[PDB]
Amino acid sequence: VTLDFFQFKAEAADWFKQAAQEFEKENPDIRININRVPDVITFNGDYSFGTFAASGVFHDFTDDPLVSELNEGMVNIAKNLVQTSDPAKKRLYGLPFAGNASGYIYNKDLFRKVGLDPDNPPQTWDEFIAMLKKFRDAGINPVQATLADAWTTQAPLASLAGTLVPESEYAALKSGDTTFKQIWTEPIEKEIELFKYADSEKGVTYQQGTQNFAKGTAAIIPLGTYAIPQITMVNKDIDLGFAQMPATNDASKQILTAGDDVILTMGANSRHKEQSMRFIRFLMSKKQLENYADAQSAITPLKETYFGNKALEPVRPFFESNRVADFCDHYIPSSINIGGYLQSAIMSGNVNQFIDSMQNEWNK
């Protein structure tokens, strides 16, 4: 048989191509075509995933023997993404394959240039902003923006909201006991502040920005762990770090936004379920998982967490202490153009217009 493998992740295209070919060598009865439900699917762990899960597009993995070896936190993330109001319908419709974190990637060599300690990034908002001013004052571009790709603007919001806005607030928001004005004003104000320290053309693509950063022209790029491989492929010698973006001056209560970066699933109505499951068990072996995590600087979904790049060391404490949070935008319906509104808020500085757009679309 031939399996249709829908693979969402641009940054990992080569890894999955090679994994599939390796699987084919050992399984001559199975061919894998990488892109009528596809048989095997990778999807980002977000609202869209949850909506397709609730509609029955995906196989129900809840009882699968593979689950017991997985990080329970990541499994529950996947289950809670299901877009349903019935607690009982929060079933597992995919397997966590890799985790991420949102914050910022920084150039350790530029840290050293201005006397900052590359192993101890800023712990508070004031210290974070002083760091950017310090880079500017020293003649270094502090922040590489990538606004032409709207989704990238969601990262600093998600990072910041991770600490400022408890996930419980989204239930209060739906029931109308709170508002975007009340919960997202401070995150968006600070995201605007952040990008005032982008001293180069802000309106460039994700690829352009990752190229710029790799070539040493910016101190930080405020994206999550998923961007690391895009950077290292442009310059293998870049000395990179990854850090939590501190949203307040309460150093003791900082939280790291972190989610299921890749969920691996199967089409509920595949005609080749046995073969599909065989490929999925191959991808979910520890060996493959850690190999993937090394290639993509990701976090494995096994109970004994493996970090794929030493750049992630500064955020290890957040994971160990369970001081993490899922992305704010996982509570925002896909029909709401959050990306577009955010890119307008960042460029224009018009907070009122951003909040009202979010609130009115939500209310509807």
Ligand SMILES: OC[C@H]1O[C@H](OC[C@H]2O[C@H](O[C@]3(CO)O[C@H](CO)[C@@H](O)[C@@H]3O)[C@H](O)[C@@H](O)[C@@H]2O)[C@H](O)[C@@H](O)[C@H]1O
């Ligand atoms: O903060 C941005 C984003 O982070 C998380 O998703 C990471 C995901 O983002 C990018 O994938 C695309 C690129 O268009 O963005 C959507 C998800 O927002 C994906 O469907 C799409 O492939 C990266 O290119 C991926 O490598 C990466 O996995 C978070 O889950 C998102 O909600 C959002 O906040």
